[PDB]
Write a protein that binds this DNA or RNA. Structure first.
Ligand code: MG
Ligand code: MG
Ligand code: MG
Ligand code: MG
Ligand code: MG
Ligand code: MG
Ligand code: MG
Ligand code: MG
Ligand code: ZN
Lengths: 83, 25, 181, 120, 69
RNA sequence: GGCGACACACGUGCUACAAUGCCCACUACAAAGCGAUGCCACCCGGCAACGGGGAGCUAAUCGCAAAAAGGUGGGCCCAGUUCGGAUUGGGGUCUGCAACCCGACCCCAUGAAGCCGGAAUCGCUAGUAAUCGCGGAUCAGCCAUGCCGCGGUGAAUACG
RNA sequence: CGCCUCCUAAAAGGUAACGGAGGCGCCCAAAGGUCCCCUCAGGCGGGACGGAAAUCCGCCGGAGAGCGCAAGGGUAGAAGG
């Protein structure tokens, strides 16, 4: 994966808004175009929308999802069955 | 075992080193 | 008469503790452990009576008394079973032969259930009795794995003179049954 | 011997008979015999029972296996389930996960070739 | 009971993996076994048997908090 | 985000179904090419990928680089069995701002289907068939089992 | 087209119509004699392969089970097992 000699979540786009909303409360929906976000455990309890190529999917967050990226919760393909 | 990652010639076929084919004389 | 451990363990550990917890005022108001029943139901013996004699030998080896057959009372279309066709093997356990079997079970056979996460304490009928089933017979130490043939297992019915379920719960727990909490 | 719960090995050379245990392979069995101090090239017909007991109190304690490695893997699959995770939904629909070609044969994961009426 | 058909119950002493000598009368005079009422982990204390893990380290994977403040 | 989607089908290839076989330890034998934004000798740490130092090399003098099959010794005892690795979980390495829908590797444990393949069909007349490994192109890294070259052992048959 | 069961049949017996409905022309050496023992079907919970019932465990259940076969009478204080 990402090498453990270095860190994680190299996106200062989203970190500033989620830390400001952490310090403020008021768990407002943020729309992000970034699937490369490996979710920081401080993001627990926020409504995040990931743009998968056509639409945003609103992703509620609980404690279990940490090492997963946000596109691991954002499906980009619809199949609905062979027939 | 040319595809098995835990034998000799599987490591020789892909050219990767490790426990099962180390380079040391 | 015999120095079986769980009988004396009952009389000196579980018998006064059940008087203490619930407030019994007569010595026969305590729950009493009588008529342990095993029916070892071999529905796979519709076509063969030769597996039934080996299962009878194994049951007589693990409890010390030889079981009887159960004849079918009622024929069905789906499951062959016409009039007779012996597909069951029932044995009841009394009088220091239930106690040695409970020693075997609680001390050897139940830890040899795979991962053995506990028992089901919700498996009470309502009037003081309990039932459980076993999958393989190799859990008992008398079964040898080189005199075995098939994957033949067990259903155990244990009876108590308790009135309610909570009385038999405390009798089974304190005498050594490993229920889930 | 009677070592890995009730699923047992017997019959000729423990150094590959430990490999049949779900959770004990070859190199892990080599570690188990190196710390215990037992012969690899000996057989399980002819060994001391103290070697058996020391092997037991090694292997059923220092790693998890028997009847709870399957429980850990199944709880990890359910951990991937129920939440909207991608790989959990791939495990849900019976579909392979680690970046596979499913246009052609993924019949390891999918099952038999469910041959369809094939129009045009 | 019935004579000649039912088996005879002999003194049976069961030896365990920890060396526990179990005292019963049964249908084989000396018994080998690998568990008892003490070595099974559900019976006695459970003593953080193999786990020492509340979960996998989901909320504990931090391994050094390295980001900009 | 997609070209990697999958209830199916076809073509070309890789790995096997084992004992003329597999694994482990040691020991040899080439050819053709590549590299001072790179190839890395040699130490230290890790079971390992690799990392930290740092010698050399504008290169028939340095390095890639061990060539493999071969040979010696030991183990396996023919059973889906240390044959065979699909697939799956956990923990890590290097690259790249970024490896999840899309990578390549290392370790642990899972270890499947396959015990020689229906109708049919393909390549080969002498180092050729078969088998075995190496190098280059692209390329930050790589799904490379593809392509192009290189060499080791070495059949059988051709009445017409 | 002969025989058996219920109704038509008007509370004894009997009672007709090309009236309403069903069977019988067999079987059992155990499905007979005696002696001794046992009591059902279902419903509510419980229990490896067991699902609405393959076998068991506890409680309720006076006869709705069964008594070879159509139906009626009868029957567990047995004619049933
Ligand atoms: Mg295993
Ligand atoms: Mg007598
Ligand atoms: Mg394409
Ligand atoms: Mg009249
Ligand atoms: Mg009259
Ligand atoms: Mg007629
Ligand atoms: Mg029931
Ligand atoms: Mg009748
Ligand atoms: Zn013990």
């Amino acid at each position: 994966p990402r090498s453990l000699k270095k860190g994680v979540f190299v996106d200062d786009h989203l970190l500033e808004k989620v830390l400001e909303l952490n310090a403020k409360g008021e768990k407002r929906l943020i729309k992000t175009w970034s699937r490369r976000s490996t979710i920081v455990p401080e993001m627990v309890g926020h409504t995040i929308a990931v743009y998968n190529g056509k639409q945003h999917v609103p992703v509620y967050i609980t404690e279990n999802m940490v090492g997963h990226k946000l596109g691991e919760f954002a499906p980009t393909r619809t199949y609905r069955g062979h027939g | 075992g040319k595809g098995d990652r835990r034998t000799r010639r599987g490591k020789i076929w892909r050219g990767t080193y490790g426990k099962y084919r180390p380079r040391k004389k | 008469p015999l120095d079986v451990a769980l009988k004396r363990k009952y009389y000196e550990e579980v018998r006064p503790e059940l008087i203490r917890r619930f407030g019994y005022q007569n010595v026969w108001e305590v729950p009493r452990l009588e008529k342990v029943v095993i029916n070892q139901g071999l529905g796979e013996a519709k076509e063969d009576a030769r597996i039934l004699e080996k299962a009878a030998q194994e049951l007589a080896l693990i409890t010390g008394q030889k079981p009887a057959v159960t004849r079918a009372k009622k024929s069905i279309s789906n499951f062959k079973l016409r009039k007779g066709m012996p597909i069951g093997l029932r044995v009841t356990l009394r009088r220091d032969r239930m106690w040695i079997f409970l020693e075997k079970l609680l001390n050897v056979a139940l830890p040899r259930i795979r991962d053995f996460r506990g028992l089901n304490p919700n498996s009470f009928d309502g009037r003081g009795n309990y039932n459980l089933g076993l999958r393989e017979q190799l859990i008992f130490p008398e079964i040898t794995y080189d005199m075995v043939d098939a994957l033949r297992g067990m259903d155990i019915a244990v009876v108590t003179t308790a009135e309610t379920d909570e009385e038999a719960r405390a009798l089974l727990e304190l005498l050594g049954f490993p229920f889930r909490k | 011997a009677r070592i890995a719960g009730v699923e047992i090995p017997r019959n000729k050379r423990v150094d590959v008979a430990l490999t049949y245990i779900y959770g004990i392979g070859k190199a892990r069995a080599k570690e188990a015999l190196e710390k215990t101090g037992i012969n690899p090239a000996t057989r399980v017909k002819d060994l001391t029972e103290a070697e058996v007991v020391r092997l037991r109190e090694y292997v059923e304690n220092t790693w998890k296996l028997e009847g709870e490695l399957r429980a850990e893997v199944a709880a990890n699959i359910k951990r991937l389930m129920d939440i909207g995770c991608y790989r959990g939904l791939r495990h849900r629909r019976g579909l392979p996960v680690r970046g596979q070609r499913t246009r052609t044969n993924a019949r390891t994961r999918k099952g038999p070739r469910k041959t369809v009426a094939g129009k045009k | 009971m019935k004579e000649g058909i039912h088996p005879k119950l002999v003194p049976a002493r069961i030896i365990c993996g920890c060396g526990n000598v179990i005292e019963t009368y049964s249908t084989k005079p000396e018994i080998y076994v690998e568990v008892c009422s003490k070595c099974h982990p559900f019976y006695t204390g459970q003593q953080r048997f193999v786990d020492t893990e509340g979960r996998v380290e989901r909320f504990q994977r931090r391994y050094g908090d390295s980001y900009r403040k």
